[PDB]
Every structure is written in C-alpha cells, then in structure tokens.
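Q: What does the assembled structure look like for these inputs?
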Amino acid sequence: RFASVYAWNRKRISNCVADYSVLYNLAPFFTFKCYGVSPTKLNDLCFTN
Amino acid sequence: FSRLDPPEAEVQIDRLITGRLQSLQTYVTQQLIRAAEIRASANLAATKM
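A:
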C-alpha cells in the first residue's frame, strides 16, 4: 500500500550501504529522468541524508 | 565528473571553462595596460637618469 497524493509519507533512511543495481531489475520503467546526478554514477557517492 | 552523464558533462564544463578563460583574458588585458603605463614611466625615468 502506498500513501495518497494529498497526504504522502516520508521514510528516513540512514546507516547502510546503498546499491542501485537492484533498482533496474523491477520492471520496464516509464521514466528514469534525473536532475542533479547521473543514474550510472549513482553507486560511487556517499549521501548525507 | 563523478556524478554527471557524459552527454551533459561537456556542456556543463563548456559553460564552466569559458568564464575562467575570459577571466584570464581580462587579467592579461589589464596587465598590458599596466605594463604600458610602467613603460611610459620607465622611459621618463631613463630620460631623467
């Protein structure tokens, strides 16, 4: 179940190892447009929050 | 270059390099005028000596 668009939810994620190769193995995606960073170099950075 | 896609990266550094390029161009542009001023002072100093 996902939250409705009028009252959505947050989920604070911290203190792990983030791998984004598991993201592409879900479905044929409608879009993957990204603004600040690149999808290919996502697995070579460390994030504050 | 650790975070951007190779299609957008040369556009971004294209918009980044030319600012410092014109900065160095303006630096040498004032340097030529300053060198001309001290040259005009140095010819007067040589005439006085």
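The radius of gyration of chain B is 21 Å.
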